[PDB]
């Protein structure tokens, strides 16, 4: 059985090859208490990660080890993985190959860095690293297409073709979920609600996941929102307080399409999708339009699919057809695609063995698994 571990900016996913759902889905956070402990004899831990950290998050200083894709702390990154194997999965890595994922246009610095910490600290028998974007359409059942990959840390648009990435055509946009959550709080204060600390940053993350949605027409919806109170919804704070938001439901997600609301010169994903496909070849351009896919938890907003379909249609020539593929399971598409890839019989060919690494060293990963 080969482990498939999905490190992510927000959520970390792990399971087994051939499974239809990740076995452990827990937040990718690390916590260190900011107050001294007065009640002795408890055996309180020094660092807290995952659900347990989320449970006691009030008295913890949560930190994301990965920010904007790049891992800013290599010491914490193993700890969540250490908790991933022995605690969440309860499996010894010494007898199972493990699968991790890599990000588009990743710097070469990291790629051996995960390699040099797995074959040594956990000494996994075998390893393979692929693009999370490539595995996205693999779960969708297609091999050629473009992925609208958006997550907590970064967003990438990758026009895959026979499962081989195009590096020049990869476009990186800094409009991720954390940006929207940071944008939700700065606009939520208009209603008298002030959320500033990191512990309550998860609270607004919970709110937008349940209440925020994508509006088809911004100009029509603000007029209706001002006129009537129908769009307003009530949310319950864990302390029992009751909050109500009138127009923020469609305003925060709209920044994904209007980055000038955040003040970023780079425009929305709708043109970035169109911008990326301009870089590809003309003959292949026909296939890419009709097999566009959405992925990541950022793309969970209701009514997001038809809104992007409408906008890029105006951008696209009238001759061309656009088919937005949005599988409802695309939340775990990156994880599921990896389990599909691991389960393949031919997947044993491009294994990197512990022995072969020893004579080849860290540099083998750039040429073996690319």
């Amino acid at each position: 059985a080969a482990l498939v571990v999905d490190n992510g900016s927000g959520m970390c996913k792990a399971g087994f090859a051939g499974d239809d759902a990740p076995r452990a889905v827990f937040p990718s956070i690390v916590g260190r208490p900011r107050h001294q402990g007065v009640m002795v004899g408890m055996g309180q831990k020094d660092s807290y990660v995952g659900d347990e950290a989320q449970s006691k998050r009030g008295i913890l200083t949560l930190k994301y080890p990965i920010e904007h894709g790049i891992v800013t702390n290599w010491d914490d990154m193993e700890k969540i993985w250490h908790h991933t194997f022995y605690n969440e999965l309860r499996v010894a890595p010494e007898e199972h190959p493990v699968l991790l994922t890599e990000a588009p246009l990743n710097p070469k610095a990291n790629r051996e860095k995960m390699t040099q910490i797995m074959f040594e600290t956990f000494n996994t028998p075998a390893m393979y690293v692929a693009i999370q974007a490539v595995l996205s359409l693999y779960a969708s059942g297609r091999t050629t297409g473009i992925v609208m990959d958006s997550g907590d840390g970064v967003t990438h648009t990758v026009p895959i073709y026979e499962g081989y990435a195009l590096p020049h055509a990869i476009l990186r946009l800094d409009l991720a979920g954390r940006d929207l959550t940071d944008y939700l709080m700065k606009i939520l204060t208009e209603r008298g609600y002030s959320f500033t600390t990191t512990a309550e940053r998860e609270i607004v993350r919970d709110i937008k996941e349940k209440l925020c949605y994508v509006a088809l027409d911004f100009e029509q919806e603000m007029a209706t929102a001002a006129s009537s109170s129908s769009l307003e919804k009530s949310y319950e704070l864990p302390d029992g307080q009751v909050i109500t938001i009138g127009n923020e439901r469609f305003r925060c997600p709209e920044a994904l399409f209007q980055p000038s609301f955040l003040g970023m010169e780079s425009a929305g994903i709708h043109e970035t999708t169109f911008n990326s496909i301009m870089k590809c070849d003309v003959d292949i351009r026909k296939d890419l339009y009709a097999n566009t896919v959405l992925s990541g938890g950022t793309t969970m907003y209701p009514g997001i699919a038809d809104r992007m379909q409408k906008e890029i249609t105006a951008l696209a020539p009238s001759t061309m057809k656009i088919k937005i593929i949005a599988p409802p399971e695309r939340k775990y598409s990156v994880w599921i695609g990896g389990s599909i890839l691991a389960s393949l019989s031919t997947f044993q060919q491009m294994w990197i063995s512990k022995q072969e690494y020893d004579e080849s060293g860290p540099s083998i990963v750039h040429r073996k698994c690319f």
């Binding site: 209603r191 008298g192 609600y193 002030s194 959320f195 500033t196 309550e200 704070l237 307080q241 909050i243």
Partner: peptide, 7 residues
Amino acid sequence: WXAXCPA
């Protein structure tokens, strides 16, 4: 404030 702080 309403939700948060004292204000």
